[PDB]
Structure formats: structure tokens, C-alpha cells
Scaffold this motif. Structure first.
Motif, PDB file in Angstrom:
ATOM      1  N   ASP A  82       0.810  -1.212   0.000  1.00 19.71           N
ATOM      2  CA  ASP A  82       0.000   0.000   0.000  1.00 19.71           C
ATOM      3  C   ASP A  82       0.848   1.268   0.000  1.00 19.71           C
ATOM      4  O   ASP A  82       0.450   2.280   0.585  1.00 19.71           O
ATOM      5  N   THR A  83       2.010   1.236  -0.648  1.00 21.18           N
ATOM      6  CA  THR A  83       2.920   2.375  -0.701  1.00 21.18           C
ATOM      7  C   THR A  83       3.019   2.949  -2.112  1.00 21.18           C
ATOM      8  O   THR A  83       4.094   3.352  -2.562  1.00 21.18           O
ATOM      9  N   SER A  84       1.896   2.994  -2.822  1.00 24.23           N
ATOM     10  CA  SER A  84       1.879   3.552  -4.167  1.00 24.23           C
ATOM     11  C   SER A  84       2.015   5.070  -4.120  1.00 24.23           C
ATOM     12  O   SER A  84       1.569   5.729  -3.176  1.00 24.23           O
ATOM     13  N   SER A  85       2.638   5.624  -5.154  1.00 23.45           N
ATOM     14  CA  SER A  85       2.907   7.051  -5.238  1.00 23.45           C
ATOM     15  C   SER A  85       2.027   7.700  -6.300  1.00 23.45           C
ATOM     16  O   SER A  85       1.328   7.030  -7.065  1.00 23.45           O
ATOM     17  N   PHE A  86       2.070   9.033  -6.325  1.00 20.96           N
ATOM     18  CA  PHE A  86       1.350   9.862  -7.289  1.00 20.96           C
ATOM     19  C   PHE A  86      -0.161   9.669  -7.210  1.00 20.96           C
ATOM     20  O   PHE A  86      -0.879   9.944  -8.177  1.00 20.96           O
ATOM     21  N   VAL A  87      -0.655   9.202  -6.065  1.00 21.71           N
ATOM     22  CA  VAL A  87      -2.094   9.054  -5.842  1.00 21.71           C
ATOM     23  C   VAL A  87      -2.437   9.554  -4.453  1.00 21.71           C
ATOM     24  O   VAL A  87      -1.630   9.469  -3.517  1.00 21.71           O
ATOM     25  N   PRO A  88      -3.641  10.106  -4.293  1.00 23.41           N
ATOM     26  CA  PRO A  88      -4.042  10.623  -2.980  1.00 23.41           C
ATOM     27  C   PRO A  88      -4.107   9.518  -1.937  1.00 23.41           C
ATOM     28  O   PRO A  88      -4.630   8.430  -2.185  1.00 23.41           O
ATOM     29  N   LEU A  89      -3.563   9.810  -0.758  1.00 26.19           N
ATOM     30  CA  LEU A  89      -3.593   8.897   0.380  1.00 26.19           C
ATOM     31  C   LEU A  89      -4.192   9.638   1.566  1.00 26.19           C
ATOM     32  O   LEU A  89      -3.603  10.604   2.060  1.00 26.19           O
ATOM     33  N   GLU A  90      -5.359   9.190   2.018  1.00 33.48           N
ATOM     34  CA  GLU A  90      -6.047   9.823   3.132  1.00 33.48           C
ATOM     35  C   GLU A  90      -5.674   9.132   4.437  1.00 33.48           C
ATOM     36  O   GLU A  90      -5.530   7.907   4.487  1.00 33.48           O
ATOM     37  N   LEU A  91      -5.510   9.927   5.491  1.00 41.78           N
ATOM     38  CA  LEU A  91      -5.086   9.427   6.791  1.00 41.78           C
ATOM     39  C   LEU A  91      -5.996   9.978   7.877  1.00 41.78           C
ATOM     40  O   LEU A  91      -6.416  11.137   7.820  1.00 41.78           O
ATOM     41  N   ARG A  92      -6.294   9.140   8.868  1.00 36.60           N
ATOM     42  CA  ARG A  92      -7.148   9.526   9.986  1.00 36.60           C
ATOM     43  C   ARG A  92      -6.633   8.871  11.256  1.00 36.60           C
ATOM     44  O   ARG A  92      -6.588   7.641  11.347  1.00 36.60           O
ATOM     45  N   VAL A  93      -6.246   9.688  12.229  1.00 34.87           N
ATOM     46  CA  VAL A  93      -5.947   9.221  13.576  1.00 34.87           C
ATOM     47  C   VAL A  93      -7.171   9.499  14.435  1.00 34.87           C
ATOM     48  O   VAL A  93      -7.569  10.657  14.610  1.00 34.87           O
ATOM     49  N   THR A  94      -7.782   8.437  14.949  1.00 32.95           N
ATOM     50  CA  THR A  94      -9.007   8.539  15.727  1.00 32.95           C
ATOM     51  C   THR A  94      -8.873   7.676  16.968  1.00 32.95           C
ATOM     52  O   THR A  94      -8.556   6.486  16.865  1.00 32.95           O
ATOM     53  N   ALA A  95      -9.095   8.276  18.133  1.00 33.31           N
ATOM     54  CA  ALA A  95      -9.094   7.508  19.369  1.00 33.31           C
ATOM     55  C   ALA A  95     -10.166   6.426  19.317  1.00 33.31           C
ATOM     56  O   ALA A  95     -11.215   6.589  18.687  1.00 33.31           O
ATOM     57  N   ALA A  96      -9.889   5.304  19.986  1.00 33.34           N
ATOM     58  CA  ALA A  96     -10.836   4.194  20.007  1.00 33.34           C
ATOM     59  C   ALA A  96     -12.200   4.630  20.524  1.00 33.34           C
ATOM     60  O   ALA A  96     -13.221   4.030  20.166  1.00 33.34           O
ATOM     61  N   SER A  97     -12.241   5.676  21.353  1.00 28.64           N
ATOM     62  CA  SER A  97     -13.516   6.230  21.791  1.00 28.64           C
ATOM     63  C   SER A  97     -14.309   6.822  20.634  1.00 28.64           C
ATOM     64  O   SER A  97     -15.524   7.014  20.758  1.00 28.64           O
ATOM     65  N   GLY A  98     -13.653   7.112  19.515  1.00 29.94           N
ATOM     66  CA  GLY A  98     -14.292   7.734  18.375  1.00 29.94           C
ATOM     67  C   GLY A  98     -13.962   9.198  18.179  1.00 29.94           C
ATOM     68  O   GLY A  98     -14.433   9.795  17.203  1.00 29.94           O
ATOM     69  N   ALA A  99     -13.164   9.788  19.067  1.00 36.74           N
ATOM     70  CA  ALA A  99     -12.805  11.197  19.006  1.00 36.74           C
ATOM     71  C   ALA A  99     -11.781  11.441  17.899  1.00 36.74           C
ATOM     72  O   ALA A  99     -10.887  10.619  17.685  1.00 36.74           O
ATOM     73  N   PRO A 100     -11.906  12.547  17.167  1.00 37.55           N
ATOM     74  CA  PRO A 100     -10.951  12.842  16.094  1.00 37.55           C
ATOM     75  C   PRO A 100      -9.659  13.427  16.643  1.00 37.55           C
ATOM     76  O   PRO A 100      -9.669  14.289  17.526  1.00 37.55           O
ATOM     77  N   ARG A 101      -8.538  12.949  16.104  1.00 37.98           N
ATOM     78  CA  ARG A 101      -7.215  13.437  16.473  1.00 37.98           C
ATOM     79  C   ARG A 101      -6.502  14.087  15.294  1.00 37.98           C
ATOM     80  O   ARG A 101      -6.089  15.247  15.383  1.00 37.98           O
ATOM     81  N   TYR A 102      -6.348  13.372  14.181  1.00 38.52           N
ATOM     82  CA  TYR A 102      -5.693  13.917  13.001  1.00 38.52           C
ATOM     83  C   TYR A 102      -6.476  13.534  11.753  1.00 38.52           C
ATOM     84  O   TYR A 102      -7.252  12.575  11.748  1.00 38.52           O
ATOM     85  N   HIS A 103      -6.255  14.304  10.688  1.00 38.90           N
ATOM     86  CA  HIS A 103      -6.877  14.029   9.394  1.00 38.90           C
ATOM     87  C   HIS A 103      -6.015  14.685   8.324  1.00 38.90           C
ATOM     88  O   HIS A 103      -5.965  15.916   8.242  1.00 38.90           O
ATOM     89  N   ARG A 104      -5.336  13.872   7.517  1.00 39.22           N
ATOM     90  CA  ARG A 104      -4.435  14.375   6.491  1.00 39.22           C
ATOM     91  C   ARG A 104      -4.703  13.690   5.159  1.00 39.22           C
ATOM     92  O   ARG A 104      -5.236  12.580   5.096  1.00 39.22           O
ATOM     93  N   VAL A 105      -4.310  14.378   4.090  1.00 43.67           N
ATOM     94  CA  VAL A 105      -4.278  13.829   2.739  1.00 43.67           C
ATOM     95  C   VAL A 105      -2.904  14.140   2.164  1.00 43.67           C
ATOM     96  O   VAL A 105      -2.548  15.313   2.005  1.00 43.67           O
ATOM     97  N   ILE A 106      -2.127  13.095   1.868  1.00 45.31           N
ATOM     98  CA  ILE A 106      -0.751  13.263   1.424  1.00 45.31           C
ATOM     99  C   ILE A 106      -0.512  12.452   0.158  1.00 45.31           C
ATOM    100  O   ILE A 106      -1.279  11.552  -0.192  1.00 45.31           O
ATOM    101  N   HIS A 107       0.575  12.792  -0.529  1.00 44.16           N
ATOM    102  CA  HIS A 107       1.114  12.000  -1.625  1.00 44.16           C
ATOM    103  C   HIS A 107       2.505  11.527  -1.225  1.00 44.16           C
ATOM    104  O   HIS A 107       3.348  12.341  -0.832  1.00 44.16           O
TER     105      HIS A 107
END
Lengths: 217, 161
Positions: A82-107
Motif C-alpha cells: 500500500d505504498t503507491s505514489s502519485f495518488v491521494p492517500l487519506e489518513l485519519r488518527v481517531t481515538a478508540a472512543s471515536g474522538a478525532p485526532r488527526y486528518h491528512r491527505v498526502i502523496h
């Protein structure tokens, strides 16, 4: 990996609060974040979710590591599939409780932090009065044709940084025209991926090589 | 979900301005949601593309939509520091006092990264300075934790008004 610690610390100095991702040899990705974690929370308290362009949303294993003093660094190492390049990669860090911590979109191709080049050699030129530098790209790193370099020219102990030369993409040699004779020079080179196809920061400096110039004719 | 709606989410996340327009011109649901409940307005604000955010808002994007974590497009823009997008959402009626599952408002997220210019703009649109999150942290408590005396003096002057 001791070098991996220095790479994470360099990116942490650029932006400590946000989630930080980088790739070393374009077949990997490591996303980490350093937080002032209490003694209770562990790696199971969060959820690292990611999605590629069309792949389904997947979970990444999280590892807990202590950094500096009183801080805990959580990091995810994506599977190589899952380390393909030149394509959008969405990321979400969320506590197990369901609370939002981080949200990024990187290449992945835009966050490349290579290793230091190797095999730096220094000779005299076929023509009189020049020094030829030659080196190798970072070992086991693809697409050397898009790697940019910069060489550092040093002098005797106590001073240095006489010159800074940027080398164009792909080229791994350098000619030096204005160098004083009968003096000890020390060279070093670092590498980074070239824009606009790639992005990132400079890597570490290569192991230096020294040379003593002959007499000026 | 819809095949046109799912494409719009990917086009908005990919920052493809012409793709976003031609999709809802073909009838794509501008309020489509992924499994996280995020709309294209979320993703357009996340990647920081003002031109895509404004066109979504003109075509009828829900400015007060919140994903399954409770974060709205105003939350994301305040986090990443996109003032022009923070200003654009408010002009279309964005809720400045929306809280996520952490009880955090856009005032909380902006102050956590020291976005001074966004904190002032949110306060001008009626941001509750005394709002506390799940941890009992107000927007002033965060400024003391990070230590931005510049930001800390701004909010105390606002709470006294």
C-alpha cells in the motif's frame, strides 16, 4: 534503526504538533506523531485508518515508543503493498472512543527523505587544475534519474564551507575549477528528490572525503 | 452512495477542480458522504483549495455537515490554517459554535496550532470564548498549555467584552 530516529527528530523540529509522514526508498511509508501521553494510554487507545485511491479503508498497526523525556511517539508503518505514489492517500488518527485526532491527505512522492549518498570519491581531472568528484546514489533507492545533489567544499579545521554547488538531476559527478593549490579540501554530498514530480527535504550528509591539491602551474 | 457521488468525493480530495464541476454538472450529489460521513466540502477544505470550496458552496454544499467524528469543514480549515476558506464558510452561514466528539469548536482547534488570524475572525462571528471541550479546556486553557502569550492576551480581552 538509529538513523530513523534522527530522521523523525528532524521532521519533528519542522512541525511537532501535526502528524508527520515520510518515505525513504519510495517503497515504504512511516507516519508518526509525538504526544505528551500519560501512563494510561497505549497503542490500543487510537486507530490509524488509511485509504488509497480506490482500495478500501484499512487499519494500520500502531507501535508505541518513548521519545526524549516524558513523551510517547506512536507510529504506523504501512505495508509495502500500500505504498503507491502519485495518488491521494487519506489518513485519519481517531481515538478508540471515536474522538478525532488527526486528518491528512498526502502523496507519498511529496514527502521523500532519502538516505545519504555513498561511495564518494575525489580525483584530479583529465585536464590540468581541477578536482573531479564522483559518488553513488543512496543504496537501493529507485528512480535515481530524479535525485538532486549538493556538494559541500570544506577547508581546514576551525573553518570551512568554502563553496556550495548544486548538481542537476541524475548527474552524479562534479568538476571544480577555482580551487587553491597545496591545500587540504574536504567534500561531502547530500541528496533530495526533484520537483515538481517529487518533494521533501535534504537528506543527511555523506561520509566526507578529503584531498590535497597539487601546485598551481 | 452513488457512482457520481463517490467520484465527486475522490475528485474533491484529489484537488481536481474541473472534475468536480463536470461531475455535479452531470448530476452528482454535492452532499455525498463516505464511510466517515465526510462531504466533498470536508475534503476540499482539508486539502486547502479555496476555488473548490467556493464552487461547492455555490452548488448547495451543506456548510454545517459534520462527519462521524463531529468535525465540520470549519473545523478542518481552522486546524490547517486556511483563513480564506474559514472566511468563505462563514459567509455561507457556517456554524462557528459546532463541537466534535471531543467537544472542541473551531476556536479550540485554531488556538491549538497558534493560528492567530483565524482566532480573531471566528471571535468576530460570535465564537463562544467560554466554551469548554470534553477535557474542560476552554480556548484560553489551550493558549496556556501551548504558551502563546500573544494568543493568550487576545482571548482574555475578548472574554472581558
Amino acid at each position: 534503526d538509529p538513523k530513523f530516529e534522527s530522521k523523525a527528530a528532524l521532521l519533528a523540529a519542522r512541525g511537532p504538533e501535526e502528524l508527520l509522514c515520510f518515505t525513504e526508498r519510495l517503497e515504504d511509508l512511516v507516519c508518526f506523531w509525538e504526544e505528551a501521553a500519560s501512563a494510561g494510554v497505549g497503542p490500543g487507545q487510537y486507530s490509524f485508518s488509511y485509504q488509497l485511491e480506490d482500495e478500501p479503508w484499512k487499519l494500520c498497526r500502531l507501535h508505541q515508543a518513548p521519545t526524549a523525556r516524558g513523551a510517547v511517539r506512536f507510529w504506523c508503518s504501512l505495508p509495502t503493498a500500500d505504498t503507491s505514489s502519485f495518488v491521494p492517500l487519506e489518513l485519519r488518527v481517531t481515538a478508540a472512543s471515536g474522538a478525532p485526532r488527526y486528518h491528512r491527505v498526502i502523496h507519498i512522492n511529496e514527502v521523500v527523505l532519502l538516505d545519504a549518498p555513498v561511495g564518494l570519491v575525489a580525483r584530479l581531472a583529465d585536464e590540468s587544475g581541477h578536482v573531479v568528484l564522483r559518488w553513488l546514489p543512496p543504496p537501493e533507492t529507485p528512480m535515481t534519474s530524479h535525485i538532486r545533489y549538493e556538494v559541500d567544499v570544506s577547508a581546514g579545521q576551525g573553518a570551512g564551507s568554502v563553496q556550495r554547488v548544486e548538481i542537476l538531476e541524475g548527474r552524479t559527478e562534479c568538476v571544480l575549477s577555482n580551487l587553491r593549490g597545496r591545500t587540504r579540501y574536504t567534500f561531502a554530498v547530500r541528496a533530495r528528490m526533484a520537483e515538481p514530480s517529487f518533494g521533501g527535504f535534504w537528506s543527511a550528509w555523506s561520509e566526507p572525503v578529503s584531498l590535497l591539491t597539487p601546485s598551481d602551474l | 452512495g452513488s457512482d457520481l457521488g463517490k467520484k465527486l468525493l475522490k475528485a474533491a480530495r484529489a484537488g481536481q477542480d474541473v472534475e468536480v464541476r463536470i461531475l455535479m454538472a452531470n448530476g452528482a450529489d454535492v452532499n455525498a458522504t463516505d464511510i466517515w460521513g465526510a462531504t466533498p466540502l470536508h475534503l476540499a477544505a482539508l486539502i486547502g483549495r479555496l476555488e473548490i470550496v467556493e464552487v461547492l458552496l455555490k452548488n448547495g454544499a451543506d456548510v454545517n455537515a459534520s462527519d462521524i467524528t463531529g468535525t465540520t469543514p470549519l473545523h478542518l480549515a481552522a486546524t490547517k490554517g486556511h483563513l480564506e476558506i474559514v472566511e468563505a464558510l462563514l459567509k455561507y452561514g457556517a456554524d462557528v459554535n459546532a463541537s466534535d466528539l471531543n467537544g472542541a469548536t473551531p476556536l479550540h482547534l485554531a488556538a491549538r496550532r497558534g493560528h492567530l488570524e483565524i482566532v480573531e475572525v471566528l471571535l468576530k462571528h460570535g465564537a463562544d470564548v467560554n466554551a469548554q471541550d470534553k477535557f474542560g479546556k476552554t480556548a484560553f486553557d489551550i493558549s496556556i498549555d501551548i504558551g502563546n502569550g500573544d494568543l493568550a492576551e487576545i482571548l482574555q480581552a475578548a472574554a472581558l467584552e
